[PDB]
């Protein structure tokens, strides 16, 4: 069986494809690879060895052909503007493919909870009430993500074919594991650790619902095999960690534990902190993937939270650049040369 | 046989084989080495005064 995902040199797509390749169709329903095909963000990138496709840019005819070739298709539009327009073209041409279809084919779009930023709760007083795959219908926008929301809704317009053709979209919490860019930046900070206290932003008490790339991949396969009868699903952890907890944990394990809360403007200076990432720093959200949690027979990495799994997550990150500490003694006479060479 | 060495009273040394064998080799080398190097002097007892 054959599946597409775009921009596999993003960790978000890439590691999902990696794990999705190793799994087996239908297996998710229980408690040899696929064929996986993908686009690259960067001409610098090269085919991931779990994947076999090569297109530094693809012919739109070629794309539509391979979109027919796959048993299921997922797309992701986080960060990338162009992926939105391309997915819209894909789903429109796919409307023709619905007439062509060998079978009812599956489409999926990957999206973030950040869409929910500007939300009145259902209970603005009991601010701890959670929201679910039912609620996103509500999701009060954020501006770029509102165009993402538009593409999502259009994808459901085509989705209406349902029994003839399936479309799906998913809201992901902050993404963690696999060198995930924000945590990578905070990993990088603590790895150097040069400040005696690590920075924290305004309140920081904002909860950031989150998913780990492997567990998201499992969710994606579960959706594919189930073909769930609600065409949007949420991908977030029970962690319910505030950002304050996230940074406290990071500094405690890697850093000095010492931490400082500072105007977000002080963070704005930073290079890899795109405005998207700063927005992720801004958001509080409170949601639980009840539909997934009932339906989906995932063998988790862990259902719990980043703060708990932190040791494993750090181990992953350290492998991600192999930064295993180097550890030496050299023996003999003293001082001159010996110390000199050691310092060299 | 050690008890026989009692009866003769010959020299006996023992060394432990559990270290990596080149250490053991160095050790028995080191102990034998005086005996060989001295050997020109068989007995040659001498007296500070």
């Amino acid at each position: 069986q054959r599946v597409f995902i775009n921009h596999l040199d993003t960790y978000s797509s890439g590691n999902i494809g990696k794990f999705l390749a190793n799994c087996v169709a239908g297996a998710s329903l229980e408690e040899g690879t696929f064929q996986i095909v993908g686009t690259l963000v960067k001409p610098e990138s090269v085919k991931p060895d779990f994947a076999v496709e090569a297109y530094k840019g693809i012919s739109r005819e070629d794309l539509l052909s391979h979109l027919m070739e796959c048993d299921a298709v997922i797309y992701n539009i986080t960060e990338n503007v162009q992926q939105v327009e391309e997915a819209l073209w894909a789903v429109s041409a796919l409307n023709e493919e619905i007439s062509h279809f060998e079978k009812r084919k599956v489409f999926i779009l990957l999206s973030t909870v950040m869409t929910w930023a500007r939300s009145k709760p259902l209970d603005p007083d009991d601010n701890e009430v959670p929201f679910t795959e039912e609620d996103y219908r509500r999701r009060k926008h954020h501006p770029n993500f509102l165009d993402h929301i538009n593409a999502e809704k259009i994808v459901l317009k085509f989705g209406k074919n349902a029994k003839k053709f399936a479309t799906y979209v998913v809201a992901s919490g902050l993404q963690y594991g696999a060198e995930g860019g924000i945590l990578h930046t905070f990993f990088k900070m603590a790895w150097l650790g040069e400040v005696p206290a690590l920075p924290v932003f305004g309140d920081g008490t904002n909860c950031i619902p989150a998913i780990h790339v492997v567990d998201l991949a499992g969710v994606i396969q579960n959706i594919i095999d189930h073909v769930p009868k609600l065409h949007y699903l949420v991908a977030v952890d029970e962690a319910v960690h505030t950002l304050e907890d996230l940074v406290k944990c990071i500094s405690k394990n890697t850093g000095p534990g010492k931490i400082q809360k500072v105007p977000k403007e002080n963070a704005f200076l930073t290079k890899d902190l795109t405005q998207e990432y700063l927005d992720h720093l801004l958001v509080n959200l409170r949601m639980e993937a009840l539909f997934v949690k009932e339906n989906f027979n995932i063998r988790w990495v862990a259902q719990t939270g980043f703060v708990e799994n932190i040791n494993s997550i750090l181990k992953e990150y350290k492998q991600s650049r192999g930064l295993l500490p180097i550890k030496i003694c050299i023996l003999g006479p003293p001082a001159v040369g010996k110390s000199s060479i050691s310092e060299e | 046989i050690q008890d026989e060495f009692d009866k003769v009273l010959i020299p006996i040394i023992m060394v432990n084989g559990a270290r990596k064998m080149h250490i053991v080799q160095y050790v028995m080398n080191m102990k034998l080495k005086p005996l060989v190097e001295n050997r020109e002097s068989i007995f040659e007892k001498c007296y500070p005064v």
Partner: protein, 48 residues
């Protein structure tokens, strides 16, 4: 011995490398690290 003696007299001034100290420490260094036994032996038993 040559390198040490070639160290500046100012540099060696009162140091552990003043020739008496240097000689004694050099001997002590050898005397500890018998081929019968050295600190290396611990790592050798770890086979690292």
């Amino acid at each position: 011995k040559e390198r040490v003696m070639n160290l500046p007299e100012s540099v060696v001034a009162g140091t552990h490398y003043s020739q008496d100290r240097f000689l004694r420490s050099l001997s002590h260094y050898r005397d500890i690290n018998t081929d019968d036994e050295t600190v290396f032996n611990y790592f050798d038993e770890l086979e690292i």
